[PDB]
Design a protein around this ligand. Structure first.
Ligand SMILES: *[C@@H]1O[C@H](CO)[C@@H](O)[C@H](O)[C@H]1NC(C)=O
Ligand SMILES: *[C@@H]1O[C@H](CO)[C@@H](O)[C@H](O)[C@H]1NC(C)=O
Ligand SMILES: *[C@@H]1O[C@H](CO)[C@@H](O)[C@H](O)[C@H]1NC(C)=O
Lengths: 224, 224, 221
């Protein structure tokens, strides 16, 4: 008898802008016509929690409860409660979840690092790493665009926010993208956008192409 | 007694992120006891309002109503209805606002333009000019940010979007920022963010500095 | 019960060089048998106003008065008056108009951004007209001497300048293909504004406005 609550984080909002919060019911015996509800602080009602899933063939419990909310009732501090009643535990169970205010917010420095000359001199495939350093709290959304056209998410891989070594309560994350290096010899655009809550407009874009940190070599200084 | 619907445009529900619909009435007698009621299509209860304007000099009056809603509720077009009831009206007066759907969407190709070499010869004050072209519908937002932090909202002037010459349904707007010749000749990178309802993260940005017209491989100088 | 005129602007003089006075009536309920009378300050007669107007489509009336007066009395302030004699009024009403600091624009053209000459399909040249007062410059665009069509450029209105107190700015964009602008193509923009001494300024940009003309560096393989 556990009831968990999976909330929507910044990666889940910003990918969709359609905040849906999920109440997970697990650890019972396999009974049908489950009774769950999603309620506010003031006891009202929401969208129905359709798309019930299958149960478990290892005989644990499976029920989800969704509700589509819009964002300001999730940030202002309204607690959202999933209520659970059934045949095993027919007593009213309350699982409350909200957004836990009381944490700082610093802005992510983003550096997009171009592929190293050891990697390119094989001429097989290059990987570009967007480094999203310095920020707090967690839950950043890193995604990649190839000149105003979002790349397929089978291609990049974002890390998880692991806490920074020398910085106190901050984080970092990474996101690598494997370009075929034949596409990097034309060297098009490759911008990395990073959606955090502490930015001014909440979206930062950095870009790197084949000639970005290249210094000037041929300093011709003719004098007369 | 004329009524005016001022629906929040995309500029207004982007720069505050606090969608806030308002409606006004002019040509009204200078008497107290205003009621301006907002409602939905189904008829729930909305936020109240205060801060009613003072008298007109021409023995007339104007009253104002402010509320707050959700953004998906705008994009769903629940035509919110504001009704005037007073001790000087003969009849109920009303307006129904919505989202005017039935429109295309198009991407603003921002281009940031660095000042004319004629103007960095007089040596007082440049004018950097973000050109925001190609979009549809109207109502783009442009904001200038120098080194993360935003510049003062009266050091730059966005125009109003005007229909582009050959392409029919598209528009263009401009925005100019004035710097002096000492701020430009250090470089400062001067970002120009463009907020528009057809961009994937709804915020794009460009940047220029005085080393952008350079060819940055050769530094061909010339001394005397 | 009002009458508003359409006085000549600088764009109304300079585009046509056939300056004219026009005035329309409003808030008057619809009727017929109206007379509008264009009349000078000292009362002498004018060009005979013709081309009678129609009713308003909002249950009211409009009426038009035409005239063609040359520039010396308009630039000095002949307070031109268009009298309405209606049926709503047995009191005929005289509505006068007039032509009421002077700085000069600094036209700078700006050649298209190098981000735009990678698409190779459109380029936008942008005649920035900053500094002037009063409003309503007339900007137009001449290509190789012969003036370009009025459907290949736009121009905003004046909009008051950010830091300057009572001075304006304007803009005008002219769209060319990349094959046009990458083959020479002088593209003069000419501002027409009264506080200029000659009353016209014109400036030019081709592709080669910036290479420094002593040296000429190339990058060969
Ligand atoms: C490039 O040449 C200029 C021309 O005199 C010289 O002053 C400068 O030191 C050189 N820069 C570098 C990085 O070598
Ligand atoms: C580039 O050339 C300028 C021109 O004098 C010179 O002052 C500067 O030091 C040079 N810089 C580099 C990085 O080559
Ligand atoms: C320099 O001049 C030569 C001949 O006039 C020409 O071939 C070359 O293209 C010029 N340089 C550039 C960058 O166009």
């Amino acid at each position: 008898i556990r009831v968990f609550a999976i909330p929507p984080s910044f990666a889940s909002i910003f990918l969709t802008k359609s905040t849906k919060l999920t109440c997970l019911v697990t650890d019972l015996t396999t009974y049908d016509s489950v009774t769950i509800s999603w309620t506010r602080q003031n006891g009202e009602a929401v969208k129905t929690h359709t798309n019930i899933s299958e149960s478990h063939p290892n005989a644990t419990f499976s029920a989800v409860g969704e509700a589509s909310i819009c964002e300001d009732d999730w940030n202002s501090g309204e607690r959202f409660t999933c209520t659970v009643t059934h045949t095993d535990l027919p007593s009213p169970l309350k699982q409350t979840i909200s957004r836990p205010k009381g944490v700082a917010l610093h802005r992510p420095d983003v550096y997009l690092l171009p592929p190293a000359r050891e990697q390119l001199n094989l001429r097989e495939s290059a990987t570009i790493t967007c480094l999203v350093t310095g920020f707090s709290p967690a839950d950043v959304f890193v995604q990649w665009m190839q000149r105003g056209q979002p790349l397929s998410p089978e291609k990049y891989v974002t890390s998880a926010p692991m806490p920074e070594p020398q910085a106190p309560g901050r984080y970092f994350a990474h996101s690598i993208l494997t370009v075929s290096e034949e596409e990097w010899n034309t060297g098009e655009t490759y911008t990395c956008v990073v959606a955090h809550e502490a930015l001014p407009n909440r979206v930062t874009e950095r870009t790197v192409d084949k000639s970005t940190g290249k210094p000037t070599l041929y300093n011709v200084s003719l004098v007369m």
